[PDB]
Design a protein around this nucleic acid. Structure first.
Lengths: 155, 129, 35, 291, 143, 298
RNA sequence: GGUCAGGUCGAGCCCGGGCUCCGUGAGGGGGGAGAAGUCGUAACAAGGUAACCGUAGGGGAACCUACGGCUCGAUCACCUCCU
RNA sequence: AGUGGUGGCCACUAUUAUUGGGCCUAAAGCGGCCGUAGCCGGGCCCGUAAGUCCCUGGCGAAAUCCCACGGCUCAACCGUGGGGCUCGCUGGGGAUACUGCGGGCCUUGGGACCGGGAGAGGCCGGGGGUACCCCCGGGGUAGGGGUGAAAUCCUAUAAUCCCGGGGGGACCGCCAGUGGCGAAGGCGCCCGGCUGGAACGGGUCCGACGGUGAGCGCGGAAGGCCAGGGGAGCGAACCGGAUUAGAUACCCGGGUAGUCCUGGCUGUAAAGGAUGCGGGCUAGGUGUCGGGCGAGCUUCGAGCUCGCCCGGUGCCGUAGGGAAGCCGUUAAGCCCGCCGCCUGGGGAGUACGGCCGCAAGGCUGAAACUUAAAGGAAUUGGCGGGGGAGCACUACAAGGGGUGGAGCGUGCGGU
RNA sequence: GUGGGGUAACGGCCCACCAAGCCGAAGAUCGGUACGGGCCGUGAGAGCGGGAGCCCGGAGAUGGACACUGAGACACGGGUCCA
């Protein structure tokens, strides 16, 4: 994470170059479909869904399995949650950032003098706005959609 | 942020050479990079090379033969017609035909001497001698 | 008012701080009598 | 805008003791304060002024005096025309007028009380705001409403140009002094007219607060004493105000009041006034005139 | 960092950058804004005609010591007053008060002063349309 | 005493865009600031030094911020507040370092009538309403009509108008403008140094936002009229005879120019024009005593 | 082709204003080389109170002192790295 | 048969730098961070042909220019013939490598989640802490204080000093380190609450979402300023004592603003690593900090020793750089992207002007004229009212004689 | 934009009406500066600087302003006024 903290720390994580999924996965594409719809039915976003699936269920990655409905695409959790109407409208990361934004703005309301968190607010707001600008360049949001603290409160 | 594979590749090659190691592993491997690696190998400046599917971007493994005085990437992709190569050759070579230039042309990226023989201009990408 | 570091070496010179302050006092009086 | 001062409504009231030989701590405090300001004022015979940082110019005398007192004395000095003052919002500037440096160098060797009294009388002599209030007393004013009527009369003659600024400011002050007295029984603030009544109080008048009002009475012996000198050099318009027969007669029929100062002081002051009447008049126009 | 920009589509700002810094030098800015041509007392002329008023001798700057002769002249062109150095030996003897003269620049560094004389920017060449040097040699005669 | 603003001497130069429909970020901040100030100002008639600080509103400028999380300079706020006071919309008193503001009854009336109207036209109607009723606005307006082009005519007009005692509704305010003129025109007429804004200046502005154009680059602030609109404004002023003429009439030279013009577009649409006309005609005497309080002794 | 009525183009002249350019012009400061006059000892060796910077005041001047910072700092020595 | 002097223009000049310049010490990186346009941008598949390239028609007029030939005796000049001249444009055909544009794939960059660990990360409520000053009660006589000496000053209406008790305001010792954290200035007493994050381990997610930033925006040491409170000590100014030829100082005795809390302004510093930031490469040796892993120890607390991996922090150091100082994987070596700055020295950070700030001031900012150097690094000597070591007789400590007072011999100055 | 006018001719060139546009940080507006090209001087070249002498195009007849003759004109060697 260098883009603001400017520290080149490497806590990233690695995936081996496997092209076909391994054999020891005793579940099939429909079974992982059943489990992922169960999981998101239980109220989890993609990151925690995939973590627990690779953790307790053991399947290393759903990206190693090819979507039946398209030969060129490798199956992903987001696509599956899009299949059944369980993907979210506002992309998950940005919803999280809005939630943290309203959180910090409240704490800041009851605490004006901590300019350190003023700067933090400035940071997280540039973050959300960059993500939103990008997604506008892609068009997965309504074009009139634009940040407001108050609707974030409604969020 | 990594932005240009080729320049990092050729710089990495030269920095291996002035030490003079044997094996180099260009992490940013691309199809155009492989074509380039073919180019000077057809003048044996390098030994064999191989592609390795790393699952992310490929990695090229290359042996050196200790015959690269300097191998730089002309970054601003100057387009040049046939009749004026001697100016650009003199821009990047020590002596008359002392090494090569790699030009991207309508047919496919490769060296400059043949491109004069075939009489097709192009876009300079790299020089080496 | 972007002070040159070269002027801070006291060789053949008066301490820069005080020359700066002198220029400021002169500025004060001149702007005053102007208006 | 609201040129008013707090918590000092009686501070100048002490000034009554000027005419009498007694002196109290507040009186000498006032004398040193006015000396400090008057010497602080530049004088060239927004380009010839000086800014008054109260925190800075209150330790000049190792006293720690209240700012409202300094504001009040500044207002007084302006009223008596010895000091040119301008007020950028929350800021004060000072400049020495022509009368100052015509009284200072001349009459520096007297007692502090003598210097204060001669300054105030000098302000009285010439058509200053003080001269207007004094002629108003000669007409028989005793309350702010009387001055309201007097100035309202004076502005509608088209001779008020030389002083229109001062009376405009006085009326502005009155617009809220009336509030501070008419319904407000507790006089929280002071105003220009109050300051003008003081200074005269220490010269020839009596001032008594009355539940907000500033009820005023004259002293006819001393009033006559100063009236003779006023007649001695009449280099100031009466503002077309009529001295009432009651006051003119009361000035008569009494044991002759002494010269309030030494006769040499009086004649020398008369001299310097006559010898500079024009320059002081022009300066005063600049203070209050318009054309 | 690397000198920038250098790209295919960045020529505009590189050009702007160099135009900006082209103001950094002195000679180009002096030429374009024509500072000399509004400060010049010679009005760009290599040689100018003047009338002399007074003879003045000066002391060489130290450690060089020596009494240098020169004259002060009012320009016929415009009327400014300027001093011209007299080179040679016995030169001042020829020149006298109220003399027509022709004067050029001293050829100092950037046209400035030369050597051991201070600020003097000019030397005479002809006096009364007769050249100084031969009178210094004495081959000709002053009128 | 002197009243005026430093630094922002050109900030109201952008008000002239109101005549046309050009749109600018400067104006975009201007009118939003105007109606924010109108919002925070309360209407508690009352009025007394104790009434101020109780039923007036303190202004801390630092909190007053744009919708950008980028602040707005103080002198601009000061200038705009002084301006829209000068047009009778606010009542502002300056106790040191704490300016106290309250709504005039015209405020919370023009607003109430026009809540769902465009911002630029909202500001326009505020200006016209201020001009129509007895304010110094109307004074400088009729001064323009008489053929006054700079401060000099304003000063002479003031001296004449105070020469009646009928100048009692708007005496004290006019005196304030006189003082500002006295201390400003000197540096704005001699030595031409341009560093402060007088009440004469800001008065010329707004009108320049309505129907004037002011050439500043003379040392002075010399202004010329726009007869095209001035016919419409003369019409609407005579439509509601609720502000006096101040005993100064239009010179024939202006009148003939006024008659010559074609029919300029009404400053607004006609329905809002008549709504303004009849609401101002309503509560005429009440606004008269309100302006009497604000700018008159009795 | 002359005289008058209307319309148009349009220099040249009077009055008012703004703009800038040039000349002179009492009076005021600072800039810079000269060698001597004279007040001082400020910095450089710890330059004799280490030196310098930022802010404020004072002093005839180099300056002095107030607080935050710096090694373009020294005097072994110094906690103590290395040895 | 021209040469000399002056003036102006290109080269000299990589001192205008795309080819092809510098910014730690020589002038040159803003104090820090955010980000708009602009510029530069990971790879794979399909298309396009806008750029890019090859061929082809019209056109870019002449004279000047290069070349062969012919005439003028040769030449210059002219003619005949061939070339390209800024050549910028335009019709048409083909190529698709890359750049552009459109459709799809991928994560490696980047962002996102999740688990323990770390820390002067903050704001907030409480609790203390030692020390100091004042005050009260007791004891106690006869001074204390301060300096090189003293003095001023406090004190016998009991001073200095000891015990008891009360008030007050600041500050949070040793633990402290070449710890930690912070974007920077900066941040340390204990507990509880609120918030910001970072590294480490997992790619579970997104799919280039980037990098830089003109214009913009934010907080930002001391000091100063506006309003209010507070004002233990310290201490600008000021007032005394002392030192001196002189003291406007250094020392000492006091003492105002300040230094503290509240709200706002002011936007500054040797804010210096005198080093703008992001990516790729590059011998090593070693420590600590922190996270993870593996061994050994264990009174069983990741509590103690060793190896490795990652990030931060040094020190030494190969190659390599550089005038040298020195640097050197934490670059000041070699490549890629962006921004700013610099163009001899003074004049000068000044004049005018603009904008900002209540003010002191801030942010932009010349010219004339004057100069041959200024400046940087290191070498030798010299010097230090620097530092170590060692010498005694032209020195000193122990010890010892005697000059200078009187007269004369003789010398030097003096007359 | 609608509809006309006059012109050799299209057009806001003009005129009556109807609308609110159009340009500017890939720098309008304003000022300083200046005929444009073929070219020429210099340089190893990248480039830098300049448009005097011939040819091509543009503009003028002391400054302004306005007509007649005419295919062609506001006409250096034709006309009228103003300065």
């Amino acid at each position: 994470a260098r883009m603001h903290a400017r520290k080149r720390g490497k806590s990233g994580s690695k995936r081996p170059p496997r092209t076909a999924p391994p054999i020891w996965v005793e579940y099939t594409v429909e079974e992982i479909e059943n489990l992922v719809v169960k999981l998101r039915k239980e109220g989890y976003s993609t990151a925690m869904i995939g973590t627990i699936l690779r953790d307790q269920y053991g399947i290393p990655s759903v990206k190693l399995f090819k979507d039946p409905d398209n030969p060129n695409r490798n199956l992903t959790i987001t696509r599956i949650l899009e299949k059944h109407g369980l993907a979210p409208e506002i992309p998950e990361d940005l919803m999280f950032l809005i939630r943290r934004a309203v959180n910090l703005r409240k704490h800041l309301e009851q605490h004006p003098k901590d300019l350190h968190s003023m700067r933090g607010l400035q940071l997280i707001e540039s973050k959300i706005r960059r993500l939103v600008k990008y997604y506008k360049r892609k068009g997965k949001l309504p074009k009139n959609w634009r940040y407001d603290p108050e609707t974030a409160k409604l969020l | 942020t990594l932005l240009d594979p080729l320049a990092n590749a050729l710089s990495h090659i030269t920095n291996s050479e002035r030490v003079g190691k044997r094996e180099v592993y260009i992490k940013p491997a691309s199809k155009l990079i492989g074509e380039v690696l073919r180019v000077m190998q057809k003048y044996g400046y390098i030994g064999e090379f191989e592609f390795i599917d790393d699952g992310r971007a490929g990695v090229y493994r290359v042996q050196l033969l200790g015959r690269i005085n300097k191998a730089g990437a002309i970054k601003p992709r100057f387009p040049v017609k046939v009749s004026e190569f001697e100016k650009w050759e003199k821009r990047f070579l020590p002596a008359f035909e002392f090494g090569i230039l790699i030009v991207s042309t309508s047919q496919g990226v490769m060296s400059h001497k043949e491109a004069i023989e075939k009489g097709i201009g192009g876009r300079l990408i790299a020089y080496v001698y | 008012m972007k002070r040159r570091p070269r002027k801070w070496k006291k060789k053949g010179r008066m301490r820069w701080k005080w020359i700066k302050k002198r220029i400021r006092r002169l500025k004060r009086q001149r702007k005053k009598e102007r208006g | 805008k609201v040129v008013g001062i707090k918590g000092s409504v009686s501070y100048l009231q002490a000034l009554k003791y000027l005419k009498t030989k007694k002196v109290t701590k507040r009186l000498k405090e006032i004398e040193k304060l006015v000396d400090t300001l008057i010497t602080l004022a530049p004088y060239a015979p927004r380009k010839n002024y000086a800014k008054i940082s109260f925190n800075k110019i209150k330790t000049v005398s190792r006293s720690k005096i209240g700012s409202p007192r300094i504001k009040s004395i500044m207002l007084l000095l302006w009223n008596f025309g010895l000091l040119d003052v301008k007020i950028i919002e929350n800021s004060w500037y000072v400049r020495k007028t022509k009368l100052a440096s015509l009284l200072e160098e001349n009459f520096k060797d007297l007692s502090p009380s003598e210097k204060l009294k001669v300054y105030l009388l000098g302000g009285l002599l010439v058509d200053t705001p003080a001269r207007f209030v004094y002629r108003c007393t000669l007409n028989g004013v005793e309350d702010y409403k009387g001055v309201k009527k007097a100035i309202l009369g004076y502005l509608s003659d088209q001779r008020s140009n030389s002083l229109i600024i001062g009376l405009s400011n006085m009326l502005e002050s009155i617009k809220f002094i009336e509030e501070a007295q008419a319904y407000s029984g507790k006089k929280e603030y002071i105003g220009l007219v109050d300051v003008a009544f003081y200074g005269l109080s220490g010269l020839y008048l009596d001032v008594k607060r009355e539940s907000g009002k500033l009820t005023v009475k004259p002293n006819f012996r001393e009033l006559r004493a100063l009236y003779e000198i006023d007649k001695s050099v009449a280099t100031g318009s009466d503002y077309g105000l009529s001295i009432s027969k009651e006051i003119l007669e009361n000035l008569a029929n009494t044991k002759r009041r002494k010269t309030i100062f030494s006769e040499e002081v009086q004649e020398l002051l008369v001299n310097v006034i006559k010898e500079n009447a024009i320059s002081i008049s022009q300066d005063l126009q600049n203070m209050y005139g318009i054309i | 960092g690397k000198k920038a920009p250098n790209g295919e589509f960045a020529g505009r700002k590189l050009k702007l950058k160099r135009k900006k810094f082209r103001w950094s030098d002195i000679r180009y800015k002096r030429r374009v804004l024509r500072l000399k041509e509004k400060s010049d007392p010679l009005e760009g002329a290599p040689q100018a005609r003047g009338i002399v008023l007074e003879k003045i001798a000066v002391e060489a700057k130290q450690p060089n010591s020596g009494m240098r002769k020169a004259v002060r002249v009012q320009l016929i062109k415009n009327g400014k007053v300027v001093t011209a150095f007299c080179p040679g030996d016995g030169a001042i003897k020829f020149i006298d008060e109220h003399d027509e003269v022709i004067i050029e620049g001293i050829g100092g560094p950037k046209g400035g002063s030369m050597g051991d004389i201070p600020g003097i920017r000019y030397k005479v060449v002809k006096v009364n349309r007769v050249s100084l040097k031969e009178l210094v040699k004495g081959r000709k005669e002053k009128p």
